[PDB]
Amino acid sequence: KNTTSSSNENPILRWMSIKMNGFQNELNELSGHMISKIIHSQRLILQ
């Protein structure tokens, strides 16, 4: 139309871009703590 949308995809880019923030943030956080934990595994097993 566009609209793009009908709130609910513009305002569910409040979902979609922010579900992309839950996803990109999820990879961010798991990336962080996983990276530092494995860093504390070469610390914790090798070192």
Binding site: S6, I12, K19
Partner: protein
């Protein structure tokens, strides 16, 4: 919670917002292409499909802490799910992690 609380989640009370006429003034001329009806043709299933995106991504996320890392250093286990080496005994490790 809110995003599920907009699908059926009224989203008609939002139509009741300007359908208070914003009185004053007197109209009541609400011709919004109402609204965001919406989504029943599979875009609701695109929404719940995205929620499967989320809980799925958490499922593979913590499911990466199922291997310990399979017993041992597969430590950089960032990707991906495979290799069920089933030497369960012993410590070093069922741990994960």
């Amino acid at each position: 919670e809110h995003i599920e609380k907009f699908l059926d989640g009224t989203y008609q009370n939002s139509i009741i917002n300007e359908k208070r006429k914003e009185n004053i003034l007197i109209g009541d001329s609400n011709i919004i292409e109402s609204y965001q009806k919406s989504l029943i043709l599979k875009e609701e299933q695109i929404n719940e499909v995205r929620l499967k995106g989320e809980e799925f991504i958490t499922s593979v996320s913590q499911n990466l802490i199922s291997f310990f890392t399979s017993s041992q250093s597969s430590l950089p286990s960032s990707l991906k799910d495979s290799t069920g080496d089933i030497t369960r005994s012993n410590k070093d490790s069922g741990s994960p992690l």
